[PDB]
Structure 1
Amino acid sequence: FQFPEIAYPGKLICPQYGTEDIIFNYVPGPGTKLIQYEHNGRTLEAITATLVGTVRCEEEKVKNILVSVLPGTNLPKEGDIVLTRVTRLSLQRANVEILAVEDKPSPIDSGIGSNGSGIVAAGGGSGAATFSVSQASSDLGETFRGIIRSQDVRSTDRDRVKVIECFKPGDIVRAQVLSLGDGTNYYLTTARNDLGVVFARAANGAGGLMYATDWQMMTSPVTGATEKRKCAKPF
């Protein structure tokens, strides 16, 4: 039969296999899971939607097929493109904070105005001192943290990369997730043409916005001065 197109949690899409001729093998992608349901005292192995949205069964290289569910009509995973803010810099690595995962801000509330009237970090106020670790995951504006090692900045010339010429504190960097890493940090990479600095300000965040002029250079419109970055290719 035809796969249903709308999907909700607990809804069964299709059995594990199907023949129409060759025997399609169904792989549970994002938004689905392979669950073994029980019916009539007997076993049924089915792909079940775990999300609300349109199901998709697309085809990639007897031959198995990817079954997923897309919302409409999140969490950093390996291969996901995340938009980050450079927080720390060192000769070995660049510390960043994940601000968005796949056009989706994380966290949903950054905690603005929580700490008062000045310019205060997410945990720079009174609330951070009195946070209940026992009853909550993390504090108000707490973000997933990430690391871009110097080796994982470029595809080539990885041995002698100067991270100071690649990123600056405050820069918005488009990166991809290499590994889950540990509890504190994801491990990220910018070693691709579409990955790297997508936003930057002159004088380390103090000046006005600069625009990307060349692969390794941005410049300020009002000053004319040029600064060295690893720019992600626009368009």
Structure 2
Amino acid sequence: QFPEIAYPGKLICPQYGFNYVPGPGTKLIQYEHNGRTLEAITATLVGTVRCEEEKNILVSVLPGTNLPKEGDIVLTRVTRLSLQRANVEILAVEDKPSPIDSGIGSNGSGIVAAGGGSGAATFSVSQASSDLGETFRGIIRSQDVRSTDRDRVKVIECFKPGDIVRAQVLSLGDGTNYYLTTARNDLGVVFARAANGAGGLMYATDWQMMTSPVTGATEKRKCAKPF
């Protein structure tokens, strides 16, 4: 019978019993016991074991009783716009903040960017991965904003700098940027402010409209569906 709980280094099952295939949180490792070769699936995480049929069976370990990848859902902030694409920064990967520490208060008083202080010029490049407050970056091309009429899309009629956007990962890209898409009904703008971030919050009214409550002014966005 299969184990109920797992820790790193714990053997789960052999390859046959049905052909077993390692999923997330598991690995296949060679073992030598009593002078004979052995194959087994080994857990790599602390959690619980569940197997689903996909005969071929996939064995996975799920934490409980990260790093963005293709197919993931992310929450981003718009940084720059042009005629061909939008630049964003990733704030959360599947309802988990990324990074844990955003670096607030590290540069003193005022309103400063993460790399806009004195410590940015003295970071040890060769002894670490990145500096305090750095995030993953992504790019949304105009042809990826929607699935239809992807040759007449106007970027400034869809997003504005400072908006919060829900997107999905398409590719790992290069070492600088991921590639993202919003071409689905549940992807798009979730939070926005009037007067390009100087006013109050707006609420979604239609598939392509948001409204300011204090003064009944309207702007054009690509609204993600609420509820």
Q: TM-score, normalised by structure 1?
A: 0.92
CA shift, 1:165, in A, is: 1.1
Residues 182-201 of structure 1: CA distance to partner in whole angstroms, max 9, x if unpaired? 10000011111111111111
Residues 22-79 of structure 1: CA distance to partner in whole angstroms, max 9, x if unpaired? xx3323222222222332233222222211112221233xx22222222121000100
Most deviating of 205-214 and 97-106: 205-214
CA shift, 1:169, in A, is: 0.7
Matched length: 227
CA 1:233–1:26 in structure 2 vs 1: closer, same or farther (change >3 Å)? farther
Map 1:105-116 onto structure 2 (within 5 A). Answer: 105-116=97-108
Q: Tell me how far apart the structure 2 counterparts of residues 17 and 212 of structure 1 sit (CA, whole Å).
A: 54
2:130 corresponds in structure 1 to 138
CA shift, 1:8, in A, is: 1.3
CA shift, 1:120, in A, is: 0.7
CA shift, 1:159, in A, is: 1.4
CA shift, 1:210, in A, is: 1.1
Give the match's secondary structure for 2:126. coil
Give % identity.
100
CA shift, 1:135, in A, is: 0.6
CA 1:39–1:145 in structure 2 vs 1: closer, same or farther (change >3 Å)? same
CA 1:52–1:225 in structure 2 vs 1: closer, same or farther (change >3 Å)? same
CA shift, 1:170, in A, is: 0.8
Q: Tell me how far apart the structure 2 counterparts of residues 219 and 182 of structure 1 sit (CA, whole Å).
A: 38
Map 1:87-102 onto structure 2 (within 5 A). Answer: 87-102=79-94
Unpaired runs of 5+ residues, structure 2, are none
1:21 corresponds in structure 2 to none
Q: Tell me how far apart the structure 1 counterparts of residues 33 and 195 of structure 2 sit (CA, whole Å).
A: 66
Q: Tell me how far apart the structure 2 counterparts of residues 196 and 53 of structure 1 sit (CA, whole Å).
A: 34
Q: Tell me how far apart the structure 1 counterparts of residues 216 and 44 of structure 2 sit (CA, whole Å).
A: 52
Q: Tell me how far apart the structure 2 counterparts of residues 184 and 95 of structure 1 sit (CA, whole Å).
A: 11
Unpaired runs of 5+ residues, structure 1, are 19-23
